[PDB]
Amino acid sequence: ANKTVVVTTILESPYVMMKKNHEMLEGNERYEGYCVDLAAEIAKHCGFKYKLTIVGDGKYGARDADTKIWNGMVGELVYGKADIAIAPLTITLVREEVIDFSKPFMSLGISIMIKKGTPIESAEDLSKQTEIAYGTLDSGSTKEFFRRSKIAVFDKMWTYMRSAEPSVFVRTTAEGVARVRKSKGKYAYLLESTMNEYIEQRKPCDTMKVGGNLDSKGYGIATPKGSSLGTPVNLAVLKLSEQGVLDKLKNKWWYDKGECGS
Ligand SMILES: CC(C)S(=O)(=O)NC[C@H](C)c1ccc(-c2ccc([C@@H](C)CNS(=O)(=O)C(C)C)cc2)cc1
Ligand SMILES: N[C@@H](Cn1cc(F)c(=O)[nH]c1=O)C(=O)O
Structure with missing residues (x-):
């Protein structure tokens, strides 16, 4: 049976931010931002329910040279604490060797x-x-x-x-x-x-x-290696790109309400 997907993400503006009135709210509704919107879109196009969680150690993901232990969002995937990372997580070789990345959703x-x-x-x-x-x-x-x-x-x-x-x-x-x-x-x-x-x-x-x-x-959406979510998530990213949704969301969170004039 389908299980609620645990999403790991990170408090980084304007990707994920706590709403000012978060105390009145709960669960996913506590947060807003580009990656909150993206998570909703991906979930809609893959047919899953999900829970947003902020990565415990507040890190992106690096492997300790001594212990070989992965930290951050990458670690949450590697050790099975989360099912998917939806965040400004850079596609890198060392990470790709241990987790899967979708096609990139944003260039940088x-x-x-x-x-x-x-x-x-x-x-x-x-x-x-x-x-x-x-x-x-x-x-x-x-x-x-x-x-x-x-x-x-x-x-x-x-x-x-x-x-x-x-x-x-x-x-x-x-x-x-x-x-x-x-x-x-x-x-x-x-x-x-x-x-x-x-x-x-x-x-x-x-x-x-x-x-x-x-x-x-680019940033990519990450899943544990071999996860059943990898394929539909990748197809969703492709679809959102082609349908102009990624451009719309970038404009929404970067430029539409820019504070330094036109
Ligand atoms: C079909 C689309 C989903 S898409 O083209 O895959 N991505 C759309 C999104 C707007 C986008 C478009 C283009 C790029 C982009 C960024 C970098 C590169 C090259 C230089 C390196 N690619 S890479 O994966 O980041 C690298 C680590 C090897 C190639 C493409 C990144 C993101
Ligand atoms: N996206 C990076 C994390 N990350 C974030 C930043 F804002 C930055 O300036 N540099 C950086 O490495 C990663 O995935 O490691």
């Missing part, structure tokens, strides 16, 4: 966020100077991109970041944004272009995305 690349007026236009710019500190989320695909890169500029950036004092790494996107906003132009934040573009249209309208993206990739 690593990007640079500055406080307005910061004299930085590119990654190369960052790499050639020391006055302005810069960093990434302390866990996830952005950090891994730099750790692994063999590209000269990116290698130079990683070599700087890994031993920077005090630390240039942050625990959450909100922390990186706060650091950019409060550091008077002396900190730049490396983050996914999707988050960057969202923040750029939020008050107090003091940040800017600069330069091209450093890579090009």
